[PDB]
Amino acid sequence: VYDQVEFDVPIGSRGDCYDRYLCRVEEMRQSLRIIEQCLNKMPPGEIKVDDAKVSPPKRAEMKTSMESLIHHFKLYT
Amino acid sequence: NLIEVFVDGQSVMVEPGTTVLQACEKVGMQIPRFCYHERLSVAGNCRMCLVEIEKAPKVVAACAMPVMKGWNILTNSEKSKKAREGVMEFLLANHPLDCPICDQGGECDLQDQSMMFGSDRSRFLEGKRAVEDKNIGPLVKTIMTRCIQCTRCIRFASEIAGVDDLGTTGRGNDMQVGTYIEKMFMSELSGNVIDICPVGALTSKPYAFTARPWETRKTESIDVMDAVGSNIVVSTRTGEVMRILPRMHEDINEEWISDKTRFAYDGLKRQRLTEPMVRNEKGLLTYTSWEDALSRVAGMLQNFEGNAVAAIAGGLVDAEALVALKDLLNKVDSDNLCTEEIFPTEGAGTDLRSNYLLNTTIAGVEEADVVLLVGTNPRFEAPLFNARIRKSWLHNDLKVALIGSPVDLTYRYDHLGDSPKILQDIASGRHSFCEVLKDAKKPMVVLGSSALQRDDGAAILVAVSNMVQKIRVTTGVAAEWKVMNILHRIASQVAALDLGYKPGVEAIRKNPPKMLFLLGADGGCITRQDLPKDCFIVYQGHHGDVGAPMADVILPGAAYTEKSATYVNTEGRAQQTKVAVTPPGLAREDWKIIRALSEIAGITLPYDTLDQVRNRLEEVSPNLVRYDDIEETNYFQQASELAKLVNQEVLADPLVPPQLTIKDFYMTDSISRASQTMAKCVKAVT
Amino acid sequence: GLREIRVHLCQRSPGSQGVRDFIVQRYVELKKAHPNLPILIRECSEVQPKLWARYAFGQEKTVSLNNLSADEVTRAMQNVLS
Amino acid sequence: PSGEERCIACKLCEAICPAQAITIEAEPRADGSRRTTRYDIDMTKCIYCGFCQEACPVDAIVEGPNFEFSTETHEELLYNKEKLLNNGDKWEAEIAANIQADYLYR
Amino acid sequence: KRPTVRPRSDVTHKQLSAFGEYVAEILPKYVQQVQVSCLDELEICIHPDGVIPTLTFLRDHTNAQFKSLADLTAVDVPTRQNRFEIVYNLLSLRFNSRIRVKTYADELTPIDSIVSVHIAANWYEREVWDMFGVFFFNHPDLRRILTDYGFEGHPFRKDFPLTGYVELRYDDEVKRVVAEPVELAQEFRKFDLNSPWEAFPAYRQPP
Amino acid sequence: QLITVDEKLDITTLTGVPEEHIKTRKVRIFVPARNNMQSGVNNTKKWKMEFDTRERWENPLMGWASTADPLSNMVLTFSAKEDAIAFAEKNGWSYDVEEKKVPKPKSKSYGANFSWNKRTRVSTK
Amino acid sequence: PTTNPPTARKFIWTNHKFNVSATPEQYVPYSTTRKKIHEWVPPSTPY
Amino acid sequence: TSVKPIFSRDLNEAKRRVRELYRAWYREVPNTVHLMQLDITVKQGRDKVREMFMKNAHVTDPRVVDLLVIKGKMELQETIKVWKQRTHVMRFFHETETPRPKDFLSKFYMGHDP
Amino acid sequence: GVQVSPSGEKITHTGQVYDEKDYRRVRFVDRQKEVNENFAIDLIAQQPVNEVEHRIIACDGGGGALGHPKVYINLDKETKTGTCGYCGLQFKQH
Numbered sequence A: 001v002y003d004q005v006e007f008d009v010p011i012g013s014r015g016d017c018y019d020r021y022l023c024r025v026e027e028m029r030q031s032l033r034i035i036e037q038c039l040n041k042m043p044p045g046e047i048k049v050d051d052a053k054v055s056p057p058k059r060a061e062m063k064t065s066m067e068s069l070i071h072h073f074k075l076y077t
Numbered sequence B: 001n002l003i004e005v006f007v008d009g010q011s012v013m014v015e016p017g018t019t020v021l022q023a024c025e026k027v028g029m030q031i032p033r034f035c036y037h038e039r040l041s042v043a044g045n046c047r048m049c050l051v052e053i054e055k056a057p058k059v060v061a062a063c064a065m066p067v068m069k070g071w072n073i074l075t076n077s078e079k080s081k082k083a084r085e086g087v088m089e090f091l092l093a094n095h096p097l098d099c100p101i102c103d104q105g106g107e108c109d110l111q112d113q114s115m116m117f118g119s120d121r122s123r124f125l126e127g128k129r130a131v132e133d134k135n136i137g138p139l140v141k142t143i144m145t146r147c148i149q150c151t152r153c154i155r156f157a158s159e160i161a162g163v164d165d166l167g168t169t170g171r172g173n174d175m176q177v178g179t180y181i182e183k184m185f186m187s188e189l190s191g192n193v194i195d196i197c198p199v200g201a202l203t204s205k206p207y208a209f210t211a212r213p214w215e216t217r218k219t220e221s222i223d224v225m226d227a228v229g230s231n232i233v234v235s236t237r238t239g240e241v242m243r244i245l246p247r248m249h250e251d252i253n254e255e256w257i258s259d260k261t262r263f264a265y266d267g268l269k270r271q272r273l274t275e276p277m278v279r280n281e282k283g284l285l286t287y288t289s290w291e292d293a294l295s296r297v298a299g300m301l302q303n304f305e306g307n308a309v310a311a312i313a314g315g316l317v318d319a320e321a322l323v324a325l326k327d328l329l330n331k332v333d334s335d336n337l338c339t340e341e342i343f344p345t346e347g348a349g350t351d352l353r354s355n356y357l358l359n360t361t362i363a364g365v366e367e368a369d370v371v372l373l374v375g376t377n378p379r380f381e382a383p384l385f386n387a388r389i390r391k392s393w394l395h396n397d398l399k400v401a402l403i404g405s406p407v408d409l410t411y412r413y414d415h416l417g418d419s420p421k422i423l424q425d426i427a428s429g430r431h432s433f434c435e436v437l438k439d440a441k442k443p444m445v446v447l448g449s450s451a452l453q454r455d456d457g458a459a460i461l462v463a464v465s466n467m468v469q470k471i472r473v474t475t476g477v478a479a480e481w482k483v484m485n486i487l488h489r490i491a492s493q494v495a496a497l498d499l500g501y502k503p504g505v506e507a508i509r510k511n512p513p514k515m516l517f518l519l520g521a522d523g524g525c526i527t528r529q530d531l532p533k534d535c536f537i538v539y540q541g542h543h544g545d546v547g548a549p550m551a552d553v554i555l556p557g558a559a560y561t562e563k564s565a566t567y568v569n570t571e572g573r574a575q576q577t578k579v580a581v582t583p584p585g586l587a588r589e590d591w592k593i594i595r596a597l598s599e600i601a602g603i604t605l606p607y608d609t610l611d612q613v614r615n616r617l618e619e620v621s622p623n624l625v626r627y628d629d630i631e632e633t634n635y636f637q638q639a640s641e642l643a644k645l646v647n648q649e650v651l652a653d654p655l656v657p658p659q660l661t662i663k664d665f666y667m668t669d670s671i672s673r674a675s676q677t678m679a680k681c682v683k684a685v686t
Numbered sequence C: 001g002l003r004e005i006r007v008h009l010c011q012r013s014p015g016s017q018g019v020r021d022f023i024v025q026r027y028v029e030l031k032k033a034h035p036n037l038p039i040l041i042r043e044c045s046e047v048q049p050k051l052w053a054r055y056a057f058g059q060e061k062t063v064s065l066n067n068l069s070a071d072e073v074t075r076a077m078q079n080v081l082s
Numbered sequence D: 001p002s003g004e005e006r007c008i009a010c011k012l013c014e015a016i017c018p019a020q021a022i023t024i025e026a027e028p029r030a031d032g033s034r035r036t037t038r039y040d041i042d043m044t045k046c047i048y049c050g051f052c053q054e055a056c057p058v059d060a061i062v063e064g065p066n067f068e069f070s071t072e073t074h075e076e077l078l079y080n081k082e083k084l085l086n087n088g089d090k091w092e093a094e095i096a097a098n099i100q101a102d103y104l105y106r
Numbered sequence E: 001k002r003p004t005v006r007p008r009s010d011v012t013h014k015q016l017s018a019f020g021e022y023v024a025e026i027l028p029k030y031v032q033q034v035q036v037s038c039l040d041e042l043e044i045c046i047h048p049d050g051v052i053p054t055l056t057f058l059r060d061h062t063n064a065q066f067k068s069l070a071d072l073t074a075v076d077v078p079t080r081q082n083r084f085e086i087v088y089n090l091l092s093l094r095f096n097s098r099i100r101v102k103t104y105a106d107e108l109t110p111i112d113s114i115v116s117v118h119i120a121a122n123w124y125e126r127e128v129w130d131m132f133g134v135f136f137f138n139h140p141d142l143r144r145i146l147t148d149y150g151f152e153g154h155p156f157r158k159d160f161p162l163t164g165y166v167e168l169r170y171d172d173e174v175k176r177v178v179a180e181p182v183e184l185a186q187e188f189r190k191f192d193l194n195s196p197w198e199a200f201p202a203y204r205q206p207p
Numbered sequence F: 001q002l003i004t005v006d007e008k009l010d011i012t013t014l015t016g017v018p019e020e021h022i023k024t025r026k027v028r029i030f031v032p033a034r035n036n037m038q039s040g041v042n043n044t045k046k047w048k049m050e051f052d053t054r055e056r057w058e059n060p061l062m063g064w065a066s067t068a069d070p071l072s073n074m075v076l077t078f079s080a081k082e083d084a085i086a087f088a089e090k091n092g093w094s095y096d097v098e099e100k101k102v103p104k105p106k107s108k109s110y111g112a113n114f115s116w117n118k119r120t121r122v123s124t125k
Numbered sequence G: 001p002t003t004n005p006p007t008a009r010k011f012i013w014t015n016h017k018f019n020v021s022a023t024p025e026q027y028v029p030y031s032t033t034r035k036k037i038h039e040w041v042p043p044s045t046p047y
Numbered sequence H: 001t002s003v004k005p006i007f008s009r010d011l012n013e014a015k016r017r018v019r020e021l022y023r024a025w026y027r028e029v030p031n032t033v034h035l036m037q038l039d040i041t042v043k044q045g046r047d048k049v050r051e052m053f054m055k056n057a058h059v060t061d062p063r064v065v066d067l068l069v070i071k072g073k074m075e076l077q078e079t080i081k082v083w084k085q086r087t088h089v090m091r092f093f094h095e096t097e098t099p100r101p102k103d104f105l106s107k108f109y110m111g112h113d114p
Numbered sequence I: 001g002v003q004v005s006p007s008g009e010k011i012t013h014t015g016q017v018y019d020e021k022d023y024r025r026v027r028f029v030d031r032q033k034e035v036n037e038n039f040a041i042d043l044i045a046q047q048p049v050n051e052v053e054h055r056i057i058a059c060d061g062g063g064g065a066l067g068h069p070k071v072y073i074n075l076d077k078e079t080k081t082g083t084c085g086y087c088g089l090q091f092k093q094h
């Protein structure tokens, strides 16, 4: 999603360890400029894609249903 | 005669009376399966083999439908995938959540087909069902809230084992599969429904709860419990055997093997031998090392020679040991190498592979037209032969007949009687069977060494050769076809007879020797009383009940899982094992033992390696390195003319194979004597 | 002192023609004359027709029968039986 | 709560342990049930990941909070079934609450 | 649209195909088996006798400007005569793109280096020679970099096993740190996992 | 430029293994037959190289299974017997083959189950 | 616990234990299994 | 047959390079057992050298010979520009290994090797 | 509860014992052999046999979640009980 949020890239003109240090610090800062928006826009929803052939399912279903249990078994062997 | 198809555009040529599924196989695309097994009949219960047929709307079942010229098939299309999704939703509606407990956890066809072709969850917010569990035997642990009702067990039983006791009882979800009573489904072939039931409903009780597949290192080997040559998969775990499985050989065992060979994997853990055990001053048996044992035996052999040295071999011993013993007693100038088994040898004996074998490949029993049995219960000795006979009598309208007591078989037939005089009666042609034979072509006459093991054996064999000459002059056949057939039980026997031994103990009864080498011979045909009192006997084996307690020295060898030895069935086939495990404690391989013994006694052989010994076999007998290749022969007419010279004649008392109660099927060799499972089998039978 | 005789041949091959002929011709005579002796036939495929005999103390001789006929078979058999 | 164990030898922990640490050897139980005879771990190899308590469908094995079990020898760290059972019978007054809180998230 | 599937676009699968035809008609020699993946990537297989021409072209020609050698790599497939597959993953900025060059090779069939062009390879080639066994000409310094300074063999192949042949330990008898043969304590469990039932009926292979 | 050498290739030296682990190791080139329990045929497609087995004992301390040989668990894949043989004879081992066990074709005239004169007639449904 | 006590269950260690590093009640490893392979128990009489 | 060469064309040029390399090792060893305070004798070192040479004498291919030469040269660089140490260099002599018994009876009494 | 062998070694819950002639029992000297006293077999035998009317019954293992997956058992076999593989509990029909 990095295409969504804003974050300005730093660069240096000389090419010395000082410029590199300053780049690292400016990135430290722009990272917070990112986190602010990540927080204020984090939506609700799921975490693992509901394709149980790839990511394991929740344990309640793993225990009640059957196909989800088979997929659990296969994923984990 | 051919017929055409265009799968996915791809074209195919097949025969009529064919199946969509066999066509898709010819192409490569595997089609799902629940109620199909190429070695069975057909049905349409499961309903997972569905496909789409272009130019026709309705789906079909590729396990029954015969392909019509011009059809374009579609396997991975929309309707097909939807059918499979629905069908598996249905199945898994009720299959309980015993996947972990289920010993068939990582091999479950249903697991795999759900993970791949099925769906990702259940839309079943309802209740399930269960069913009572049955006791069916001390081998086949039955859970029956898992049977998807495929009917594989039912068809397999009603066709192969002729049992006719299993079946379905009810209609609707309440259906069950299993006898209506607490009967026991014990049989020489009970023990393949395990491999056939894709689910963990009919599990094996011994293996159960012990391990899982993926952990295993599946090595490959063969069987020795009988002289058939059942290719086998031996499963290991952290350096130990855990289970045995069949291995597909389209000729010999064809994906089926015997209760004995698959449940005698425990006898390799009880009553074993791990250290050189030598007599003491009192006579007890104390442990000691190879240094002592071989120093002793070689210092004694250096003094003994002539014909006072005698080697006996039993079953379950390898051609390598046999050849090494032969060459050693040769360099020592002795010839009393014999086997615990008898084989009437007068006339020709052991000089032509056309004799003492199955001149006819076991396969040819499918193409034969009439079969005759001479005093044998193959149901107990070499059953898979009996299963080929079963399928033959079932399919190609066969006619079978036998000589011997009235035996409990799977089919019905004509019973001649119980006196081999019947054989000469036939050779004259004064018995309806004479006309039956002279009419029908490609007959076959099999004779089990269980009778030759009698006393008047060579005479009955001579009468049989006479009968054979008669039948051959009656009907029109060539040596390209064969008539006579011999069927042993012990494995090492054929390798010995090909290495040129004395198949008997007549030599021993004639020349009481001093030193007695004996290998794997837990048969007790010999003991201390049949010999002088100052003898010296060396038991080289891997199990002690009979031969060891009567021993001066006891050496351990190895079993059929730990020595890369050859072996030969009753049709000249040459099968080698593969070392699946390493033996216990001090025990070593037999040919190594013997090369060391020779090097000590100053008789050094040129054999430092299994491969050098393979070349030695290539010299001695060539067809023992021809792995998986039979060697036909045609000089049986000469052998029969030779035997005709002899005038010995049979006795009058009847004959019997000494295995009638299935009880006798178990407890043959050390392994089936030892296993604490065979005990349960027997006590359940009785 | 002779102890045992064995023949190795290759069914359905030229080099074995004379040996097969001898066997279908007179082997019967040897085996009826002296039947207290090991005479072992063995026919593989793709081998050199040969004859391995073995004396008392284990030593043994190997001779060839390739591209030969019944007369040479007989005479070699005699020379080795001697 | 009835004293009985939870492991039934489903071997998922063995087949998923990235380090191949675990070693299992199962058997029947004289009462007919299914159970273990050998469930050994090498805490020198265990990377402390979580996969075993993710796979165990019965929540039997649970990597716990105790991080003070440093020792003086490399044989107090090849834990076995009995040491694990003791650790369970010891810490079960805490794991119950921890899981009762955490399970919903998973 | 569906939530659990990326979009299989057209722009890339078309542009990179055009560029593949371009390079193919420019270098009808030193080229074979161009291809574009179903996931927006370009692969170009070439004879080892054209490596430097291809790389110089792709670095210099304006329309490519494949400047930065983001990676060099090897792969081993033993079911063929030329068993090693050498790989270069390259990056260009102006055109914001990546590309993959492949060339087959074999033990006992060395390769031409590129150090004259991409100096990054000066070390990837050392890695390759140390691990696999593939050799490179015109390379100033070529020595074991990763493994020991006495190690012998070629581990990243598929035959040199995981555990290796030798272990180490100190032996006060001599006070050194000696190398002895492998006698493990636990055995490397090898889990049979490959399940039969075919899942991908599109990547099948008939008899 | 090129060479005329008709000698068989051997790189046992560059490989880096000792005499023991190169000579006494009997290699087996086979095809892994199906797990009868299953009915799957995407395993009987390759050609696999394995080694003979070796000592596999039990540790005294706890009971694990150790090994003196590293190769025991070295299973290799191939798509052709000729290529597998080339690799084997190239590395210098002693190869032994297990040829292909292929099923037969069969005629399943289902209707036969419901026949009149034959013996195939089943007593079940 | 005074406001959130645990589940009152048996089979729980009542008397907790400090660390057991080198004490004489420390821990050691072993096998929890029987003997895989039995053997032969020769007789006790000369022939 | 029709193949591509490497650094050479025939066993003879391969062998001239090999001889150069022998000269290098022979003229080097002393510097090693004098820099790294070893114990063995120069003669024993040269024995190991000539043995590691003789144990590749069943060779025919110039490509094989040349690859072995390249690896030897790498190792010689490593040694003279001292990176390998006492351990790295004495790892050859199997100084903590019972000579593998080739006596068939020895193998028998001791283990399972054929 | 634990028992003991001739040599004083605490038998495990699975019959592991070091006979008098085994050298692998030095590690215990000056040390102890860790064992659990609570034997699962007795602790499940003590438990009461559950009773129900609905012939079929669903078992989970205690908590709705946190226990063994839902397994459904039959109880029509009045000869004896019906056990649950995971938890070991046993039900009976009314």
Ligand code: SF4
Binding pocket: B095, B096, B097, B098, B099, B100, B102, B103, B104, B105, B106, B108, B109, B110, B111, B146, B198, B199, B200, B201
């Ligand atoms: S057969 Fe076994 S593994 Fe397969 S679905 Fe049923 S319980 Fe699970």
Ligand code: SF4
Binding pocket: B146, B147, B148, B149, B150, B151, B152, B153, B154, B177, B196, B197, B198, B199, B201, B202
């Ligand atoms: S018990 Fe097994 S083989 Fe028999 S019908 Fe049920 S699923 Fe099929």
Ligand code: SF4
Binding pocket: D013, D016, D017, D018, D019, D021, D022, D041, D045, D046, D047, D048, D049, D050, D051, D052, D053, D063
């Ligand atoms: S937490 Fe440790 S024991 Fe459990 S799976 Fe991860 S590495 Fe293995």
Ligand code: SF4
Binding pocket: D006, D007, D008, D009, D010, D011, D012, D013, D014, D052, D055, D056, D057, D058, D060, D061
């Ligand atoms: S995952 Fe849990 S139940 Fe399964 S074997 Fe491991 S500890 Fe036992």
Ligand code: FES
Binding pocket: B032, B033, B034, B035, B036, B043, B044, B045, B046, B047, B048, B049, B061, B062, B063, B064
């Ligand atoms: S395989 Fe066709 S319905 Fe079962």
Ligand SMILES: [Zn+2]
Binding pocket: I059, I060, I061, I068, I084, I085, I086, I087, I088, I089
């Ligand atoms: Zn329960």
